[PDB]
Symmetry: C2
Subunit: 31 residues, 2 copies
Amino acid sequence: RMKQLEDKVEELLSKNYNLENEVARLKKLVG
Amino acid sequence: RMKQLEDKVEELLSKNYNLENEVARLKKLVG
């Protein structure tokens, strides 16, 4: 369960980097 | 450290929900 929690942190960080990359692409379209 | 890992999961999920809400607002502007 240490490892499962660590795995979930790594997974959520990857998801937020994808969301960050998407926000930047959309902001480039608006801006 | 169990608690610290759990805290980090909860924090990253809140960040991704904010990013999700931002993506939806920007997509509403484009769409």
